[PDB]
Design a protein around this ligand. Sequence first.
Ligand SMILES: C[C@@H]1COCCN1c1cc(C2([S@](C)(N)O)CC2)nc(-c2ccnc3[nH]ccc23)n1
Length: 137
Amino acid sequence: SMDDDQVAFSFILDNIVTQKMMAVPDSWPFHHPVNKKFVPDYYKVIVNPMDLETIRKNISKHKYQSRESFLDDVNLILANSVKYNGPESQYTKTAQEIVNVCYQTLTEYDEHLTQLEKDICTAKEAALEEAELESLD
Ligand SMILES: C[C@@H]1COCCN1c1cc(C2([S@](C)(N)O)CC2)nc(-c2ccnc3[nH]ccc23)n1
């Protein structure tokens, strides 16, 4: 079912986050949203904040239906470090390793993720078609 497939897809992504990305050494700056009381300037600069806790919350809500949408938020972590800390900051080097281990692990699971992504997309289109046919009955 689309529910079993979304659960599987989300579990794979969550395991990539907790077992690989969160395990990158010294990755603590990216585990949670920046606290405005600690870094008030952060939210004057960073318009689209992102972090690994927020990604996990999004996974639990089944936000990500595709590898692309998942990686959109993953890359935001890196892009935001480039902007706030600079492209050569040690913070950005760490964010880069987080992104790289994400890519590496996605590649290991690309066969299964690609199939889940396709099957979720077909089931979603079918449910949309049926809902529209029912509303017009
Ligand atoms: C602003 C820096 C550099 O870019 C990425 C995130 N970064 C963070 C992130 C955090 C959080 S947190 C405690 N939830 O705000 C998410 C874990 N914290 C501090 C921080 C907080 C207080 N003093 C500090 N001194 C130096 C850094 C620092 N930096």
